Amino acid sequence: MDIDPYKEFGATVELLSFLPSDFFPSVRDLLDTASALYREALESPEHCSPHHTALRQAIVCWGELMTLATWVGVNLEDPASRDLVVSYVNTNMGLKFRQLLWFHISCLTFGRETVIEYLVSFGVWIRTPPAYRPPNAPILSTL
Amino acid sequence: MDIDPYKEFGATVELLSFLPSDFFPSVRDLLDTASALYREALESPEHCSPHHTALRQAIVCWGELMTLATWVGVNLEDPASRDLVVSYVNTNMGLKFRQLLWFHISCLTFGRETVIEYLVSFGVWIRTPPAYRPPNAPILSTL
Amino acid sequence: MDIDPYKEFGATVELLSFLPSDFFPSVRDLLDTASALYREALESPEHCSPHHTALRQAIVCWGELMTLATWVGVNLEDPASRDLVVSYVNTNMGLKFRQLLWFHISCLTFGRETVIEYLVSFGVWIRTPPAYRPPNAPILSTL
Amino acid sequence: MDIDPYKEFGATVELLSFLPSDFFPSVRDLLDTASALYREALESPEHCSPHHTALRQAIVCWGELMTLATWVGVNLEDPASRDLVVSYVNTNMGLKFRQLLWFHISCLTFGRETVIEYLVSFGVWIRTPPAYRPPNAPILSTL
Ligand SMILES: COCCOCCOCCOc1ccc(C(C)(C)CC(C)(C)C)cc1
Ligand SMILES: COCCOCCOCCOc1ccc(C(C)(C)CC(C)(C)C)cc1
Ligand SMILES: COCCOCCOCCOc1ccc(C(C)(C)CC(C)(C)C)cc1
Ligand SMILES: COCCOCCOCCOc1ccc(C(C)(C)CC(C)(C)C)cc1
């Protein structure tokens, strides 16, 4: 239905299109970050924020995908296709899942405005060729 | 994190378990409804409601699952494994997807409170033995 | 029962597992620190702080564990079983003990809130990729 | 270091030595008493009292020792060593644990002052030879 999961929050798939894949932590790392920083709120009966809502939904999706992967490994007799499906799920879907988790966690942490500014600046940086861009990328940190 | 996607909305997997699985409409039907009634709001850059947020996330996840099914039908060779994966995706993941779509669309349309009352009333109905179970099952209506 | 030795201090086993196990100093190092810095207060007849109380209890428990290990070395004959017991103690219970000692000493020294923020920040740091995190690991300092 | 876990509260190991070792109720009984009277306070995120702070740590230590005992019963195939270790734990560590539990549960139920007066009076009673010792020993009570 031509839905962008970030347009509601002030971003776009094209704005995060520039962040490389090596930029995002692993799924386990991001899920641990969430479970340690906002678990009491995600497991809460309150609409603490749209970021919380989206995180809840995406975590449920990922749980269902892991269930799918287990079911595949248990019910498919062709190892080739089994590993192919599992690899597609992990690589692609987890890349998207990392994108979304990072966006929402970083927003909850720093600010939606700050994260969008960081995205703009990081796009400026990554579009520049290495011969003319500084070697050290921009950094979003609590320290 | 053990997250319930309805806890914030005032329900639970136990309160929706009152409804059978053969109750929820088709994914096609629910998506047509969602389009016809809230396309401009779901495509909007606004947190119109947590229901809208959750519904957007669910729809993007279903789109990714359809992409997975297509990628499977293309790449995978073993017809048994292809059909197994596609049928599992559709049946199970779409059962859950329709559950969620029904909940959120019905809420947006009638009321979260109305939908929870409908859940308890349908529980009463389905628990009533057939000898005394009226045929006029409960149904949501604006009239 | 379901007791967390950290919740009164505003932390959790989930938050202290958010840091690696190879990060926490040795039992000897932490006990030397505790002595040098708070021996007169831990050997005092005052509830100087809940940190002091918990640390006293932990140290007495570790002393009883050391007595157990010596008693094992003496009485037990099977060297395999003896070594296995002593190793279990000094590894598992040692890790737990030094996590707790680190928490409480670092709190007494820098601040409970400072230490919790440090846990969060160091976890996010060691989970973030190097090219996009600051290059130097976080550390607590009174200087 | 030389830490007495009672002088923080107003007692010593020499004062509680007035009571014999066969005086203290079993770990089962004392843990049931605690679960009955102060479960919600021990499981609370509050420094309700130093007695709570100490009892929490003691119970955590006891849980770790029980884990050790089960791990022993599993991984050790020398019944002699298994039994030796489990018996040592449940006897010596059990005695110390139930001393501490008695002290703290009593000081929570009655008070530091009442419990110390009780210790002194019971010392009188027990140092008194039996030919001149009343049968109605001192017995803590609110009635
Ligand atoms: C292979 O991925 C490359 C990066 O993605 C490019 C387009 O980005 C759009 C991302 O859109 C989504 C879609 C779905 C999702 C959810 C939360 C539903 C999770 C998923 C991918 C596990 C189904 C997240 C982001
Ligand atoms: C196989 O279904 C069993 C019945 O469902 C039990 C309910 O389980 C709770 C989780 O429900 C959902 C519902 C929807 C979803 C979304 C919207 C993310 C879509 C899905 C199922 C395509 C991943 C996820 C979990
Ligand atoms: C065999 O028992 C001797 C009785 O005399 C006790 C002398 O020592 C004082 C008791 O000190 C402790 C030490 C540790 C503990 C804790 C709470 C840590 C529990 C334990 C014994 C399970 C480790 C309690 C009391
Ligand atoms: C191998 O351990 C895995 C990591 O454990 C995570 C923490 O588990 C919760 C238990 O936490 C503690 C911490 C310290 C302690 C004390 C200080 C009482 C010491 C000990 C371990 C000797 C009993 C007890 C429990």
XYZ file of C-alpha atoms and ligand atoms in Angstrom:
672
model
C 0.000 0.000 0.000
C 3.063 2.216 -0.475
C 3.857 2.511 3.233
C 7.169 3.822 4.550
C 7.844 2.675 8.143
C 9.757 5.901 8.896
C 7.665 8.601 7.203
C 5.592 8.630 10.392
C 8.756 9.482 12.342
C 10.207 12.029 9.931
C 12.578 9.902 7.874
C 12.528 7.888 4.667
C 13.918 4.697 3.195
C 16.070 6.900 0.966
C 17.562 8.731 3.950
C 18.668 5.457 5.546
C 19.527 4.052 2.107
C 23.039 5.435 2.594
C 23.971 3.806 5.893
C 26.027 0.746 4.888
C 25.400 -2.767 6.146
C 28.622 -2.721 8.184
C 27.158 0.241 10.081
C 24.479 -1.661 11.959
C 25.149 -3.950 14.923
C 23.978 -7.523 14.799
C 20.404 -8.512 15.556
C 21.423 -10.090 18.856
C 23.379 -6.982 19.837
C 20.479 -4.646 19.085
C 17.970 -6.897 20.833
C 20.210 -6.998 23.901
C 20.497 -3.211 23.776
C 16.709 -2.970 23.733
C 16.164 -5.589 26.435
C 18.613 -3.715 28.659
C 17.461 -0.144 28.015
C 13.694 -0.271 27.378
C 12.512 -3.749 28.387
C 10.358 -2.566 31.285
C 8.644 -0.176 28.862
C 8.265 -2.510 25.891
C 6.723 -5.146 28.173
C 4.460 -2.426 29.590
C 0.737 -1.917 28.945
C 1.312 1.735 28.008
C 1.807 3.396 24.614
C 4.984 4.973 25.948
C 5.913 6.147 22.444
C 5.416 5.273 18.773
C 9.025 4.130 18.850
C 8.080 1.631 21.548
C 5.068 0.519 19.514
C 7.143 -0.062 16.386
C 9.852 -1.861 18.349
C 7.270 -4.202 19.862
C 5.789 -4.978 16.459
C 9.179 -5.580 14.854
C 10.341 -7.822 17.692
C 7.182 -9.903 17.314
C 7.850 -10.148 13.579
C 11.424 -11.287 14.215
C 10.234 -13.885 16.704
C 7.868 -15.274 14.094
C 10.702 -15.327 11.555
C 12.937 -17.250 13.947
C 10.084 -19.695 14.471
C 9.911 -20.024 10.685
C 13.638 -20.725 10.468
C 13.433 -23.409 13.155
C 10.409 -24.979 11.468
C 12.352 -25.035 8.200
C 15.390 -26.665 9.760
C 13.094 -29.274 11.283
C 10.685 -29.927 8.393
C 12.736 -29.552 5.189
C 14.721 -32.527 3.899
C 16.706 -30.623 1.246
C 19.688 -29.046 3.062
C 20.424 -26.813 0.073
C 17.018 -25.127 0.092
C 16.907 -25.165 3.896
C 20.174 -23.262 4.274
C 19.198 -21.012 1.364
C 15.966 -19.941 3.056
C 17.654 -19.490 6.428
C 20.425 -17.402 4.872
C 17.965 -15.202 3.000
C 15.953 -14.652 6.171
C 18.941 -13.819 8.337
C 20.904 -11.677 5.878
C 18.140 -9.666 4.201
C 15.407 -9.542 6.823
C 17.917 -8.998 9.613
C 19.502 -6.162 7.683
C 16.103 -4.490 7.495
C 15.424 -5.381 11.137
C 18.752 -3.871 12.191
C 17.979 -0.738 10.202
C 14.655 -0.337 12.000
C 15.885 -1.259 15.480
C 18.840 1.094 15.159
C 16.606 3.928 13.991
C 14.142 3.539 16.844
C 16.669 2.872 19.612
C 18.853 5.768 18.488
C 15.801 8.005 18.390
C 14.662 7.012 21.878
C 18.236 7.639 23.030
C 19.300 10.897 21.351
C 16.277 12.445 19.657
C 14.490 12.064 16.341
C 15.813 15.460 15.239
C 19.363 14.546 16.234
C 19.139 11.218 14.416
C 17.841 12.866 11.254
C 20.624 15.454 11.368
C 23.111 12.616 11.790
C 21.588 10.845 8.796
C 21.891 13.957 6.631
C 25.520 14.495 7.625
C 26.373 10.814 7.191
C 24.868 10.897 3.718
C 26.992 13.916 2.857
C 29.998 11.957 4.113
C 29.282 8.639 2.398
C 28.407 10.248 -0.941
C 31.787 11.963 -1.009
C 34.448 9.759 -2.592
C 37.214 8.637 -0.229
C 39.764 10.855 -1.969
C 37.914 13.928 -0.687
C 36.054 12.755 2.396
C 37.596 12.656 5.865
C 38.556 9.116 6.865
C 36.688 9.116 10.172
C 32.937 8.952 9.707
C 30.477 10.948 11.806
C 29.615 9.427 15.152
C 26.446 9.289 17.249
C 27.402 8.468 20.823
C 26.419 9.003 24.440
C 30.071 9.717 25.275
C 11.705 -9.805 25.846
C 8.330 -11.549 26.030
C 6.135 -8.979 24.294
C 2.385 -9.089 23.719
C 1.386 -6.869 20.763
C -2.052 -6.176 22.295
C -1.086 -5.411 25.905
C -0.884 -1.692 25.222
C -4.208 -1.865 23.380
C -5.856 -3.450 26.412
C -6.016 -7.056 25.248
C -3.917 -10.211 25.348
C -3.242 -13.371 23.396
C -5.492 -15.064 25.950
C -8.371 -12.644 25.383
C -8.130 -13.088 21.611
C -7.836 -16.859 21.989
C -11.561 -16.682 22.742
C -11.958 -16.354 18.982
C -11.155 -19.416 16.860
C -8.756 -19.378 13.928
C -11.518 -20.028 11.378
C -13.110 -16.735 12.468
C -10.689 -14.167 11.127
C -11.259 -13.047 7.527
C -8.862 -13.455 4.639
C -5.728 -11.351 4.442
C -7.032 -10.154 1.079
C -10.327 -9.042 2.618
C -8.676 -7.305 5.561
C -6.163 -5.513 3.342
C -8.920 -4.350 0.990
C -10.794 -3.022 4.020
C -7.694 -1.275 5.350
C -7.018 0.318 1.980
C -10.571 1.479 1.359
C -10.926 2.944 4.837
C -7.502 4.209 5.992
C -5.147 4.279 2.993
C -4.539 8.020 3.208
C -3.934 7.802 6.956
C -1.560 4.843 6.779
C 0.345 6.570 3.964
C 0.412 9.782 6.004
C 3.423 11.304 7.799
C 1.622 11.391 11.147
C 1.228 9.313 14.297
C -2.508 9.372 13.764
C -2.808 6.549 16.290
C -0.908 3.600 17.770
C -3.295 1.437 15.783
C -2.083 3.160 12.623
C 1.542 2.653 13.644
C 1.107 -1.041 14.409
C -0.890 -1.564 11.226
C 1.820 0.079 9.121
C 4.459 -2.155 10.681
C 2.330 -5.258 10.156
C 1.721 -4.375 6.514
C 5.415 -3.782 5.819
C 6.222 -7.119 7.464
C 3.617 -8.896 5.344
C 5.068 -7.258 2.250
C 8.491 -8.576 3.195
C 7.013 -12.042 3.720
C 5.400 -11.941 0.282
C 8.769 -10.900 -1.122
C 10.268 -13.914 0.653
C 7.655 -16.231 -0.833
C 8.304 -14.896 -4.333
C 12.077 -15.139 -3.898
C 11.543 -18.724 -2.754
C 9.349 -19.713 -5.677
C 12.026 -18.247 -7.935
C 15.272 -19.521 -6.431
C 14.404 -22.776 -4.670
C 14.236 -25.811 -6.951
C 12.774 -28.608 -4.809
C 9.016 -28.205 -5.374
C 8.283 -29.943 -2.079
C 10.352 -27.426 -0.115
C 9.058 -24.458 -2.116
C 5.429 -25.416 -1.521
C 6.089 -26.270 2.123
C 7.621 -22.865 2.816
C 4.944 -20.944 0.925
C 2.077 -22.822 2.571
C 3.566 -22.426 6.042
C 4.110 -18.710 5.505
C 0.595 -18.142 4.237
C -1.341 -20.369 6.640
C 0.450 -19.693 9.931
C 1.988 -16.261 9.517
C -1.160 -14.978 7.827
C -3.332 -16.379 10.581
C -1.334 -14.256 12.997
C -1.283 -11.348 10.542
C -5.065 -11.439 10.130
C -5.545 -11.665 13.891
C -3.588 -8.433 14.227
C -5.215 -6.753 11.227
C -8.682 -7.645 12.478
C -7.904 -6.294 15.932
C -6.517 -2.982 14.734
C -8.990 -2.353 11.908
C -11.944 -3.249 14.120
C -10.558 -0.896 16.749
C -9.999 2.013 14.361
C -13.527 1.434 13.077
C -15.641 0.774 16.193
C -13.585 1.383 19.329
C -10.968 -0.406 21.401
C -13.515 -0.776 24.202
C -16.167 -2.013 21.780
C -13.737 -4.599 20.418
C -12.790 -5.870 23.872
C -16.458 -6.142 24.831
C -16.979 -7.994 21.556
C -14.205 -10.377 22.550
C -15.797 -11.210 25.891
C -19.249 -11.536 24.310
C -17.957 -13.859 21.593
C -16.284 -15.879 24.321
C -19.644 -16.227 26.044
C -21.221 -17.266 22.749
C -18.597 -19.826 21.745
C -18.493 -21.312 25.247
C -22.268 -21.655 25.334
C -23.290 -25.213 24.425
C -24.978 -25.426 21.020
C -28.322 -26.539 22.444
C -28.589 -23.014 23.876
C -26.161 -21.172 21.586
C -28.093 -18.707 19.420
C -27.246 -18.812 15.715
C -26.942 -15.015 15.622
C -23.291 -14.895 16.563
C -22.085 -11.503 17.796
C -20.976 -9.069 15.124
C -19.589 -5.553 15.100
C -21.770 -2.863 13.566
C -22.026 0.916 13.483
C -25.815 0.809 13.109
C 12.707 -16.675 46.022
C 12.903 -14.283 43.063
C 15.429 -11.827 44.483
C 17.725 -9.671 42.367
C 20.700 -8.368 44.381
C 20.761 -5.212 42.258
C 17.195 -3.881 41.902
C 17.404 -1.889 45.133
C 20.496 -0.274 43.611
C 18.747 0.344 40.295
C 20.379 -2.346 38.177
C 19.734 -5.900 37.045
C 21.470 -9.133 36.150
C 20.398 -8.328 32.599
C 22.214 -4.997 32.819
C 25.405 -6.468 34.264
C 25.412 -9.273 31.709
C 25.189 -6.427 29.192
C 28.947 -6.223 29.682
C 31.300 -9.087 28.795
C 32.503 -11.501 31.433
C 36.141 -10.878 30.480
C 35.709 -7.229 31.501
C 35.345 -7.574 35.244
C 38.613 -7.499 37.212
C 39.892 -10.376 39.299
C 38.635 -11.238 42.763
C 42.049 -10.496 44.248
C 42.251 -7.104 42.542
C 38.766 -6.112 43.667
C 39.320 -7.313 47.232
C 42.593 -5.395 47.425
C 40.751 -2.313 46.184
C 37.961 -2.812 48.719
C 40.459 -3.183 51.542
C 42.613 -0.218 50.579
C 39.638 2.089 50.130
C 36.896 1.031 52.575
C 38.380 -1.385 55.119
C 37.756 0.960 58.042
C 34.148 1.454 56.919
C 33.358 -2.199 56.239
C 34.873 -3.186 59.592
C 32.800 -0.439 61.226
C 29.592 -0.740 63.287
C 27.584 1.563 61.018
C 25.151 1.204 58.125
C 27.377 3.590 56.227
C 25.484 2.602 53.078
C 23.567 -0.317 51.566
C 26.596 -0.755 49.338
C 28.702 -1.293 52.452
C 26.149 -3.757 53.822
C 25.926 -5.808 50.631
C 29.699 -5.785 50.269
C 30.184 -7.060 53.822
C 27.740 -9.892 53.177
C 29.400 -10.760 49.870
C 32.843 -10.829 51.465
C 31.727 -13.103 54.297
C 30.134 -15.426 51.734
C 33.344 -15.506 49.704
C 35.278 -16.308 52.863
C 32.991 -19.246 53.552
C 33.475 -20.365 49.943
C 37.245 -20.255 50.403
C 36.878 -22.325 53.563
C 34.820 -24.785 51.528
C 37.502 -24.984 48.848
C 40.242 -25.611 51.411
C 38.086 -28.206 53.170
C 37.577 -29.899 49.807
C 41.283 -29.922 49.023
C 41.897 -31.509 52.416
C 39.098 -34.040 52.860
C 38.176 -35.065 49.323
C 40.438 -37.721 47.822
C 39.333 -37.922 44.183
C 41.548 -35.245 42.591
C 39.241 -35.008 39.577
C 36.195 -34.180 41.697
C 38.226 -31.878 43.939
C 39.591 -29.895 40.989
C 36.151 -29.776 39.380
C 34.532 -28.340 42.510
C 37.269 -25.766 43.049
C 37.128 -24.739 39.390
C 33.349 -24.367 39.422
C 33.623 -22.198 42.518
C 36.427 -19.949 41.339
C 34.954 -19.537 37.843
C 31.170 -19.273 38.170
C 30.910 -17.982 41.721
C 34.026 -15.928 41.109
C 32.429 -14.217 38.124
C 29.264 -13.451 40.066
C 31.260 -12.256 43.081
C 33.453 -9.946 41.040
C 30.503 -8.543 39.102
C 28.917 -7.647 42.437
C 32.135 -6.279 43.934
C 32.784 -4.197 40.828
C 29.259 -2.800 40.952
C 29.406 -1.825 44.609
C 32.992 -0.543 44.728
C 32.522 1.465 41.539
C 29.305 2.867 42.974
C 30.889 3.905 46.271
C 33.723 5.456 44.261
C 32.023 7.268 41.359
C 28.254 7.181 41.761
C 25.422 4.699 41.357
C 23.978 6.657 38.436
C 27.433 7.119 36.926
C 28.024 3.368 37.071
C 24.674 2.516 35.500
C 25.278 5.010 32.697
C 28.718 3.455 32.283
C 27.220 -0.021 31.966
C 24.829 1.173 29.268
C 27.462 3.160 27.385
C 30.134 0.455 27.471
C 27.647 -2.160 26.298
C 26.493 -0.033 23.386
C 30.133 0.773 22.623
C 31.376 -2.819 22.540
C 28.339 -3.722 20.442
C 28.835 -0.869 17.978
C 31.244 -1.373 15.068
C 34.695 0.199 15.458
C 34.575 2.372 12.345
C 31.521 4.137 13.780
C 32.221 4.113 17.517
C 34.844 6.158 19.348
C 38.139 4.266 19.267
C 38.953 4.260 22.993
C 36.976 2.122 25.407
C 35.074 3.942 28.164
C 36.548 3.973 31.639
C 35.716 5.446 35.023
C 38.065 8.054 36.456
C 38.135 10.255 39.541
C 40.904 12.406 38.095
C 39.207 -8.946 56.018
C 37.826 -9.228 59.549
C 34.171 -8.407 58.891
C 31.526 -9.320 61.447
C 28.106 -9.413 59.727
C 26.304 -8.367 62.933
C 28.110 -5.382 64.468
C 26.623 -3.198 61.746
C 23.367 -3.942 63.587
C 24.554 -4.074 67.186
C 25.594 -7.647 67.834
C 28.584 -9.931 67.351
C 29.445 -13.553 66.724
C 30.265 -13.855 70.421
C 26.832 -12.609 71.479
C 25.004 -15.033 69.187
C 27.257 -17.773 70.555
C 25.142 -17.510 73.701
C 22.578 -19.536 71.781
C 23.596 -23.144 71.065
C 23.769 -24.415 67.515
C 20.855 -26.823 68.041
C 18.659 -23.806 68.824
C 18.198 -22.373 65.372
C 15.230 -23.499 63.251
C 15.781 -25.206 59.944
C 16.482 -23.367 56.710
C 13.131 -24.571 55.386
C 11.288 -23.124 58.379
C 13.109 -19.791 58.292
C 12.727 -19.352 54.537
C 9.016 -20.096 54.891
C 8.793 -17.499 57.662
C 10.485 -14.971 55.389
C 8.336 -15.793 52.361
C 5.330 -15.305 54.625
C 6.221 -12.073 56.380
C 8.584 -10.086 54.127
C 8.459 -11.573 50.618
C 7.049 -8.455 48.965
C 9.617 -6.307 50.770
C 12.597 -8.487 49.878
C 11.447 -8.623 46.251
C 10.978 -4.867 46.286
C 13.230 -2.252 44.646
C 13.688 -0.361 47.906
C 16.245 -0.160 50.703
C 13.465 -0.889 53.146
C 16.071 -1.663 55.810
C 19.621 -2.960 56.278
C 18.020 -6.163 57.518
C 16.343 -6.533 54.133
C 19.558 -5.642 52.323
C 21.436 -8.354 54.213
C 18.732 -11.006 54.020
C 18.521 -10.569 50.249
C 22.249 -11.162 49.828
C 22.161 -14.146 52.172
C 19.313 -15.725 50.219
C 21.141 -15.135 46.934
C 24.230 -16.827 48.385
C 22.110 -19.763 49.535
C 20.593 -20.097 46.078
C 24.054 -20.164 44.542
C 25.091 -22.846 47.026
C 22.040 -24.913 46.098
C 23.012 -24.571 42.444
C 26.478 -25.779 43.428
C 24.980 -28.771 45.222
C 22.856 -29.775 42.228
C 25.758 -29.242 39.827
C 27.815 -31.506 42.083
C 25.185 -34.224 42.266
C 25.113 -34.125 38.469
C 28.709 -33.732 37.307
C 30.446 -35.736 40.056
C 30.228 -39.513 39.663
C 31.972 -40.225 42.985
C 29.074 -40.593 45.466
C 31.505 -40.271 48.368
C 32.692 -36.835 47.242
C 29.182 -35.773 46.239
C 27.785 -36.673 49.658
C 30.717 -35.115 51.501
C 30.294 -31.803 49.683
C 26.504 -31.665 49.954
C 26.582 -32.590 53.639
C 29.261 -30.019 54.437
C 27.261 -27.329 52.665
C 23.890 -28.129 54.197
C 25.408 -28.553 57.669
C 28.013 -25.825 58.178
C 26.817 -23.258 55.665
C 23.288 -24.170 56.667
C 24.037 -23.434 60.312
C 25.589 -20.057 59.545
C 22.775 -19.204 57.127
C 20.102 -20.060 59.665
C 21.874 -18.077 62.383
C 21.803 -15.033 60.116
C 18.204 -15.656 59.067
C 17.065 -16.038 62.668
C 18.825 -12.826 63.657
C 17.411 -10.726 60.842
C 13.871 -12.124 60.802
C 13.686 -11.643 64.567
C 15.040 -8.096 64.406
C 12.487 -7.322 61.698
C 9.604 -8.900 63.609
C 10.532 -7.661 67.097
C 13.547 -5.334 66.919
C 17.289 -5.021 67.431
C 16.818 -4.097 71.075
C 14.336 -6.848 71.883
C 16.528 -9.426 70.157
C 19.694 -8.355 71.959
C 17.929 -8.312 75.320
C 16.699 -11.783 74.388
C 20.241 -12.912 73.638
C 21.467 -11.652 77.009
C 18.568 -13.175 78.944
C 18.953 -16.502 77.149
C 22.650 -16.423 77.963
C 21.729 -16.034 81.617
C 19.250 -18.897 81.326
C 21.699 -21.222 79.580
C 24.710 -20.441 81.787
C 22.517 -21.107 84.808
C 23.056 -24.768 85.760
C 19.914 -26.885 85.437
C 19.372 -27.477 89.154
C 18.500 -23.763 89.403
C 17.334 -23.175 85.824
C 13.641 -22.408 85.287
C 11.848 -24.428 82.612
C 10.176 -21.367 81.096
C 13.066 -20.210 78.955
C 12.938 -16.778 77.307
C 10.771 -17.016 74.203
C 10.319 -14.044 71.875
C 6.663 -13.143 71.481
C 4.310 -10.246 70.826
C 1.787 -11.601 73.344
C 17.959 -6.229 2.386
O 17.635 -5.054 3.108
C 18.298 -3.920 2.600
C 17.941 -2.709 3.393
O 16.564 -2.412 3.223
C 16.306 -1.513 2.153
C 14.923 -0.983 2.277
O 14.688 -0.607 3.627
C 13.329 -0.704 4.025
C 13.230 -1.467 5.299
O 11.854 -1.812 5.499
C 11.546 -2.685 6.510
C 10.565 -3.632 6.280
C 10.179 -4.483 7.301
C 10.755 -4.400 8.562
C 10.240 -5.269 9.719
C 10.225 -4.464 11.019
C 8.795 -5.699 9.461
C 11.134 -6.515 9.973
C 11.486 -7.682 9.025
C 12.403 -7.223 7.898
C 12.240 -8.672 9.906
C 10.284 -8.392 8.416
C 11.758 -3.459 8.764
C 12.153 -2.606 7.749
C -0.146 -19.656 13.850
O -0.938 -18.711 14.543
C -1.286 -19.154 15.835
C -2.303 -18.236 16.430
O -1.703 -16.984 16.732
C -1.370 -16.829 18.105
C -1.080 -15.394 18.392
O 0.317 -15.200 18.544
C 0.641 -13.897 19.008
C 1.413 -13.167 17.965
O 0.489 -12.671 16.988
C 0.993 -11.958 15.931
C 0.101 -11.367 15.058
C 0.573 -10.639 13.981
C 1.938 -10.489 13.755
C 2.460 -9.632 12.593
C 1.567 -8.411 12.361
C 3.855 -9.091 12.912
C 2.506 -10.409 11.248
C 3.175 -11.760 10.916
C 2.430 -12.912 11.571
C 3.070 -11.902 9.403
C 4.644 -11.845 11.311
C 2.816 -11.103 14.641
C 2.353 -11.827 15.723
C 29.522 -24.004 61.347
O 28.939 -22.785 61.774
C 29.674 -22.169 62.809
C 28.750 -21.384 63.684
O 29.379 -20.183 64.109
C 29.276 -19.141 63.149
C 30.556 -18.377 63.101
O 30.631 -17.624 61.898
C 29.709 -16.546 61.842
C 28.728 -16.769 60.742
O 29.143 -15.993 59.609
C 28.408 -16.087 58.457
C 29.067 -16.210 57.248
C 28.344 -16.243 56.071
C 26.958 -16.151 56.074
C 26.169 -16.070 54.761
C 24.954 -15.156 54.927
C 27.026 -15.445 53.657
C 25.628 -17.452 54.299
C 26.388 -18.749 53.946
C 26.862 -19.474 55.202
C 25.371 -19.629 53.229
C 27.584 -18.538 53.025
C 26.313 -16.057 57.302
C 27.027 -16.023 58.485
C 28.652 -17.922 35.969
O 27.832 -16.846 36.378
C 27.101 -16.301 35.306
C 26.870 -14.849 35.549
O 25.924 -14.680 36.593
C 25.120 -13.522 36.421
C 24.619 -13.050 37.743
O 23.725 -14.009 38.285
C 22.966 -13.502 39.373
C 23.629 -13.852 40.655
O 24.345 -12.699 41.116
C 25.148 -12.837 42.217
C 26.257 -12.023 42.341
C 27.058 -12.114 43.465
C 26.766 -13.017 44.483
C 27.603 -13.056 45.770
C 28.254 -11.700 46.050
C 26.704 -13.368 46.968
C 28.760 -14.091 45.700
C 28.737 -15.585 45.313
C 28.684 -15.734 43.798
C 30.048 -16.176 45.818
C 27.583 -16.371 45.923
C 25.657 -13.840 44.327
C 24.854 -13.754 43.209
